[PDB]
Design an enzyme around this catalytic site. Sequence first.
Site, PDB file in Angstrom:
ATOM      1  CB  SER A 131      -3.442  27.547 -45.485  1.00 11.79           C
ATOM      2  OG  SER A 131      -3.561  27.429 -46.899  1.00 11.79           O
ATOM      3  CG  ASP A 177     -10.155  23.617 -47.933  1.00  7.55           C
ATOM      4  OD1 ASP A 177      -9.866  24.277 -48.956  1.00  7.55           O
ATOM      5  OD2 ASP A 177      -9.434  23.603 -46.910  1.00  7.55           O
ATOM      6  CG  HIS A 209      -8.462  27.103 -47.198  1.00  8.51           C
ATOM      7  ND1 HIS A 209      -7.865  25.877 -47.001  1.00  8.51           N
ATOM      8  CD2 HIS A 209      -7.458  28.010 -47.239  1.00  8.51           C
ATOM      9  CE1 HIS A 209      -6.552  26.034 -46.950  1.00  8.51           C
ATOM     10  NE2 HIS A 209      -6.280  27.319 -47.089  1.00  8.51           N
TER      11      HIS A 209
END
Length: 259
Positions: A131, A177, A209
């Site tokens: 991320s 995502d 995600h």
Amino acid sequence: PNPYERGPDPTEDSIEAIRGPFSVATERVSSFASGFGGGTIYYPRETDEGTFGAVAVAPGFTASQGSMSWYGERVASHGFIVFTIDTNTRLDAPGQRGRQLLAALDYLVERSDRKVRERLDPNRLAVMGHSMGGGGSLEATVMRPSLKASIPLTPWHLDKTWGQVQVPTFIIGAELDTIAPVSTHAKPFYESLPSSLPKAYMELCGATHFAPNIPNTTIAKYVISWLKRFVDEDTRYSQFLCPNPTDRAICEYRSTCPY
């Protein structure tokens, strides 16, 4: 003739197993640098073949769901020193994650326990992150061009071009995502890496995600292969990367094969 080759010749089964051929020990580190928190070092126990490269693994969220712990034993068991960075410390920018990754690596080189240090080749270091930590992996490779490999996992970053990256980079995106959509994060990042860079993009079918935060055979097998190929220059792992993988779990793959 490759001084960095570790472990027996790989197979598809061996890279898909829950662990590789090395057994693993750990060293818990309460703080690897002021302001950056701590983590756990996982390292291979067997020393007969020589020292190992190392990878620092950063999360992107202050939340238990953002844990990157499982990469520690999974990757170290294939012959790497792996520093998983705890989620406790809150960081709100990818640049901070880039600095955190480098601080973790510098701890390995300069201040780690002798059992780790004696197993470490300080010239062969790599980064991986989830991320904003994946944005941090990108950042770290511009901050430290001597890194050997970078693996941004479902990366998030507001800056969309990565033309200064000279470190072999493997971006893993998650098809569904909506936090770091591949259309506006992972794919633009991949396409903007230099065309001459050894690079790849792998998109996981149906993944969201937080797919990178739990054991995942497809992520692990290609993470292991990428680190072998570039931290160790181990061309025994090229067979898994070129031509592009066609696993059912993969919904898109791009690469600069042959490397």
